[PDB]
Amino acid sequence: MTGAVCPGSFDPVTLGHLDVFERAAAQFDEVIVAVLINPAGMFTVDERIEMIRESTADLPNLRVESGQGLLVDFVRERGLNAIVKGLRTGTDFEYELQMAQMNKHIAGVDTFFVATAPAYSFVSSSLAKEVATYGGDVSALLPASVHQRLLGKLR
Amino acid sequence: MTGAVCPGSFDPVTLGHLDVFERAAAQFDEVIVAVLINPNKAGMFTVDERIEMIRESTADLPNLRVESGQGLLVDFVRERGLNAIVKGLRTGTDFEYELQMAQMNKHIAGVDTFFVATAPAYSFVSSSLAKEVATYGGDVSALLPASVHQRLLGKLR
Amino acid sequence: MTGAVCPGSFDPVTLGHLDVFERAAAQFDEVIVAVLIAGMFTVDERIEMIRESTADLPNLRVESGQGLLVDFVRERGLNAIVKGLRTGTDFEYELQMAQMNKHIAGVDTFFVATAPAYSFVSSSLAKEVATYGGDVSALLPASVHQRLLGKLR
Amino acid sequence: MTGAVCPGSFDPVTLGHLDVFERAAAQFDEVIVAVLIAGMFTVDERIEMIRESTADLPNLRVESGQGLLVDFVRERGLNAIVKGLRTGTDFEYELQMAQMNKHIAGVDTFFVATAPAYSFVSSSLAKEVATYGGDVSALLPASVHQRLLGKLR
Amino acid sequence: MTGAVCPGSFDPVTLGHLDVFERAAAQFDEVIVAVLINPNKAGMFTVDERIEMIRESTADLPNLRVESGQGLLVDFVRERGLNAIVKGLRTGTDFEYELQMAQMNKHIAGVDTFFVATAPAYSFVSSSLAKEVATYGGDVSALLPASVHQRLLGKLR
Amino acid sequence: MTGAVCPGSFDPVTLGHLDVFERAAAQFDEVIVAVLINPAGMFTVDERIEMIRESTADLPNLRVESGQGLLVDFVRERGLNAIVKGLRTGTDFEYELQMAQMNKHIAGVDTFFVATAPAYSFVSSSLAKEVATYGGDVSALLPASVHQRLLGKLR
Numbered sequence: 001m002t003g004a005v006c007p008g009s010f011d012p013v014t015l016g017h018l019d020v021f022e023r024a025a026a027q028f029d030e031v032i033v034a035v036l037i038n039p040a041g042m043f044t045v046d047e048r049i050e051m052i053r054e055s056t057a058d059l060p061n062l063r064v065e066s067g068q069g070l071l072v073d074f075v076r077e078r079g080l081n082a083i084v085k086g087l088r089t090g091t092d093f094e095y096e097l098q099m100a101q102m103n104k105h106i107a108g109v110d111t112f113f114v115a116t117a118p119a120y121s122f123v124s125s126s127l128a129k130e131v132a133t134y135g136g137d138v139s140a141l142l143p144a145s146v147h148q149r150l151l152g153k154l155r
Numbered sequence: 156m157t158g159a160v161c162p163g164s165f166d167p168v169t170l171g172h173l174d175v176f177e178r179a180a181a182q183f184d185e186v187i188v189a190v191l192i193n194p195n196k197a198g199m200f201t202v203d204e205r206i207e208m209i210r211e212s213t214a215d216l217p218n219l220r221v222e223s224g225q226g227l228l229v230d231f232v233r234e235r236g237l238n239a240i241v242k243g244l245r246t247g248t249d250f251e252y253e254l255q256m257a258q259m260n261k262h263i264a265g266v267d268t269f270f271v272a273t274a275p276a277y278s279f280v281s282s283s284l285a286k287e288v289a290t291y292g293g294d295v296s297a298l299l300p301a302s303v304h305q306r307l308l309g310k311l312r
Numbered sequence: 313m314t315g316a317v318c319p320g321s322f323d324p325v326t327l328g329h330l331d332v333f334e335r336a337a338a339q340f341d342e343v344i345v346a347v348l349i350a351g352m353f354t355v356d357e358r359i360e361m362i363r364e365s366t367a368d369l370p371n372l373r374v375e376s377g378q379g380l381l382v383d384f385v386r387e388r389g390l391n392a393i394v395k396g397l398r399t400g401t402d403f404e405y406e407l408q409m410a411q412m413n414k415h416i417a418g419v420d421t422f423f424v425a426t427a428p429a430y431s432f433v434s435s436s437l438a439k440e441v442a443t444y445g446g447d448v449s450a451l452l453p454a455s456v457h458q459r460l461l462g463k464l465r
Numbered sequence: 466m467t468g469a470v471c472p473g474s475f476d477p478v479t480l481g482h483l484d485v486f487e488r489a490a491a492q493f494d495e496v497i498v499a500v501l502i503a504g505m506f507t508v509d510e511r512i513e514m515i516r517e518s519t520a521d522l523p524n525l526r527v528e529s530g531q532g533l534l535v536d537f538v539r540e541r542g543l544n545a546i547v548k549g550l551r552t553g554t555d556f557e558y559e560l561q562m563a564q565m566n567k568h569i570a571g572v573d574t575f576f577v578a579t580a581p582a583y584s585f586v587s588s589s590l591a592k593e594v595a596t597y598g599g600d601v602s603a604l605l606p607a608s609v610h611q612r613l614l615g616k617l618r
Numbered sequence: 619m620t621g622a623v624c625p626g627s628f629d630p631v632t633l634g635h636l637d638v639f640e641r642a643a644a645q646f647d648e649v650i651v652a653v654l655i656n657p658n659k660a661g662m663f664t665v666d667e668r669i670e671m672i673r674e675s676t677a678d679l680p681n682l683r684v685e686s687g688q689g690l691l692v693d694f695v696r697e698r699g700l701n702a703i704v705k706g707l708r709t710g711t712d713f714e715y716e717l718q719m720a721q722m723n724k725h726i727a728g729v730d731t732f733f734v735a736t737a738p739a740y741s742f743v744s745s746s747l748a749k750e751v752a753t754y755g756g757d758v759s760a761l762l763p764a765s766v767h768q769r770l771l772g773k774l775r
Numbered sequence: 776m777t778g779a780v781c782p783g784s785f786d787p788v789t790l791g792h793l794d795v796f797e798r799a800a801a802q803f804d805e806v807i808v809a810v811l812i813n814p815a816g817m818f819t820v821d822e823r824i825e826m827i828r829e830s831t832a833d834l835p836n837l838r839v840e841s842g843q844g845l846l847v848d849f850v851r852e853r854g855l856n857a858i859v860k861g862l863r864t865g866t867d868f869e870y871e872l873q874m875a876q877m878n879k880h881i882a883g884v885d886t887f888f889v890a891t892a893p894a895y896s897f898v899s900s901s902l903a904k905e906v907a908t909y910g911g912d913v914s915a916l917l918p919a920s921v922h923q924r925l926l927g928k929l930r
């Protein structure tokens with residue numbers, strides 16, 4: 001039985017994230033989305049977890065959990081040793097490569113990167129929030145449920 | 156039954172490739188190494204030679220097999236009932252041009268591509284640079300499996 | 313009297329190229345597509361395919377050329393190039409030619425990011441995929457696609 | 466009726482920025498420099514410094530703004546941004562914002578490669594160097610440089 | 619009498635830094651490690667601690683010395699009668715932003731900068747990532763000299 | 776006594792190359808410019824060597840020699856173990872990094888990279904030849920003597 005962890009802050013989850021979740025769930029027997037609790041953002045951890053669960057309702061082999069500290073501990077504690085992450089640019093690859101090599105060195109945990117779907121290559125949680133704050137329409141870039149909650153926080 | 160295809164020309168296979176094979180074999184139920192052959196331009200090693208060098212250095216990976224092919228990689232993948240490619244990457248430059256091919260492959264056949272950063276120690280080895288260095292007498296013994304190094308010197312002499 | 317030149321081999325023109333043409337036509341009074349003159353299509357064929365695909369762009373025209381792009385540009389009274397860009401790698405090598413062109417002829421180059429949907433399309437990859445039976449119909453203008461099938465079949 | 470907006474904080478404007486302004490003014494009928502509103506200079510100060518440095522550009526004006534750049538652009542009847550670029554790293558992060566801006570408001574972005582001589586100048590590095598006594602006089606408009614000395618001395 | 623300055627905050631020095639020091643010491647008659655201290659924000663280690671960790675792991679480099687400084691690097695370099703900086707680089711992204719600073723330093727003071735690719739084995743270590751990983755309990759003993767690892771754990775506990 | 780080798784095809788030498796030569800000569804006791812003879816280009820090896828010698832007449836600690844085969848053999852045969860090369864882009868760095876790591880691995884030879892002077896960041900031997908072929912003026916980008924010879928070959 002194979003498995004991977006998809007880590008992030010997901011504040012909020014975007015369609016870019018969801019695309020990665022879907023592709024991981026299609027290729028591994030089990031996927032765990034790991035939501036970081038940090039020393040902070042727009043949505044509480046529980047809010048983020050619920051938005052991810054709504055968006056991944058049709059992925060039966062994917063579950064969502066929170067964690068803190070070293071990601072490789074979160075991964076190994078659950079019997080796995082693979083991370084799956086989405087990538088948008090060469091710059092992304094160079095920073096993430098450092099962390100991937102470090103994670104493999106310290107804990108034997110592998111990282112698999114997947115290129116973003118072209119349609120979602122310019123979406124990030126940060127930019128979506130920023131645009132929405134000033135009234136820009138980001139409804140095509142977020143799951144439907146997320147866009148609903150986001151308008152709420154902003155009002 | 157999960158599975159992935161690890162493609163390349165593997166002319167010859169390097170320790171960087173082998174590292175990628177091992178990591179894929181650890182994470183997928185089956186792995187197929189796809190040895191892509193250009194029917195127009197012969198490489199240094201024949202198809203038989205390429206496959207033998209890979210098999211000899213992967214004997215301890217019981218869920219990996221090696222097959223050659225040509226034409227579209229996505230056809231090789233789909234005809235085996237799979238839809239994942241695993242490829243090793245060294246640089247940001249690598250990521251950008253492989254990004255193009257992965258998006259195209261997803262578009263035309265729904266095949267996914269997963270990239271892995273190769274191990275630091277093998278980051279600077281490529282089949283082509285190993286060949287070039289060996290051609291002019293440089294020592295590349297530590298970058299190639301034992302199944303390769305002396306066959307390579309043999310080809311060159 | 314603003315104007316820009318959109319250069320390339322366009323063998324064949326793709327929807328990525330067409331997107332750039334449309335954006336250049338929307339921002340300059342005058343756009344010329346400059347077709348460089350052994351690929352798949354003849355110069356006349358490439359010109360025709362672009363003309364077919366840009367009929368709704370009244371301020372655009374298509375011409376062939378040879379030699380330095382800056383001479384093609386300057387001989388038509390203009391001094392700006394508009395070119396599409398996909399990657400950072402693209403930017404760094406196009407940057408060298410942009411600075412060279414500015415240096416030798418005072419011709420400016422404006423780059424525009426490809427539309428997300430065409431980030432992975434190029435003339436070369438479309439031909440390669442199509443050659444092995446892959447469906448590239450969503451990546452090429454309708455006219456082009458039929459013509460491409462013909463060259464292969 | 467062509468036009469483009471050149472955005473930034475310009476704290477202060479550098480010769481790199483000015484080069485881009487001049488190139489945009491040469492290719493569009495109308496250029497607006499958009500100054501975003503705790504840096505070194507006040508908004509009024511930054512606006513003044515740019516106006517001083519662009520007196521020879523008759524089709525350029527300088528205005529301050531807040532919020533989404535695309536709204537600043539659209540509210541003035543335009544839909545193009547012109548921005549200067551130094552590196553491939555620059556292109557990849559600016560690319561994300563360019564595609565976002567096109568998506569949300571249909572505003573195009575044209576990038577231009579910095580002049581070779583200004584490849585290493587930025588507002589931040591000029592301030593940092595000047596703060597420790599380094600001579601940045603060859604990298605800033607004459608007016609700006611004097612004003613900068615004043616803020617430090 | 620040739621010479622180069624190797625700058626950094628070295629908070630703490632890593633094996634990647636040490637590799638760069640050794641390569642500079644091999645190619646220049648004298649090398650000065652320049653420990654740059656921000657008078658506004660304290661790092662994890664004091665200036666004394668940073669210098670001691672560097673000295674302890676460079677004892678076999680007789681043409682290298684260690685001095686702290688602040689403000690413009692080019693002033694530190696020129697006041698010692700030198701005009702070369704040697705810096706290690708990992709990525710293309712590293713090269714682009716260090717490129718800016720090297721051009722600026724050449725412009726304002728005529729100081730040259732030479733970059734070296736760090737060794738593959740140390741490519742992914744940085745002072746900041748080593749600190750972050752150690753903070754949350756990860757094992758970074760193989761990435762730092764002996765002079766550093768336990769002092770680091772000490773700071774953290 | 777310190778030393779470095781500056782390798783290339785130099786077909787022809789540009790002001791970008793010369794800038795690198797000057798900076799190497801200022802920092803090492805001895806510099807050797809190594810001109811590759813290849814399996815080819817516009818200028819013969821002897822022509823290239825003479826153009827480099829004219830351009831570096833004021834660098835007494837720099838000499839010019841031809842070589843073939845493995846660069847690290849050329850370097851070690853002359854008692855040195857350092858290469859100095861100019862770099863223009865991050866892309867350049869990524870390709871050259873591979874070769875530098877390989878050269879250090881196989882022969883213990885170090886490589887030091889130096890960023891191009893801003894004024895010469897867009898010049899290359901290849902682009903200068905191409906531009907000159909079609910009548911473009913590249914005289915500000917090449918040593919004076921080189922531009923003279925180049926016009927000759929083209930006529």
Ligand SMILES: O=C(O)CCc1c[nH]c2ccccc12
Nearest residue numbers: 007008034036067068069071
């Ligand atoms: O955003 C990421 O890629 C990593 C998030 C992350 C770091 N440590 C973690 C521990 C538990 C869950 C998530 C994380």
Ligand SMILES: O=C(O)CCc1c[nH]c2ccccc12
Nearest residue numbers: 319320346348377378381384
């Ligand atoms: O592909 C490109 O961008 C350059 C094509 C090109 C070079 N010189 C040219 C002259 C005329 C028309 C096109 C060209």
Ligand SMILES: O=C(O)CCc1c[nH]c2ccccc12
Nearest residue numbers: 472473499501530531534537
């Ligand atoms: O620096 C930039 O390129 C963006 C500045 C910017 C964002 N929103 C803006 C609104 C008005 C004027 C300027 C801005």
Ligand SMILES: O=C(O)CCc1c[nH]c2ccccc12
Nearest residue numbers: 782783809811842843844846
């Ligand atoms: O162009 C380069 O950087 C390398 C040229 C080169 C490779 N092997 C060489 C051997 C002798 C002289 C030069 C060379």
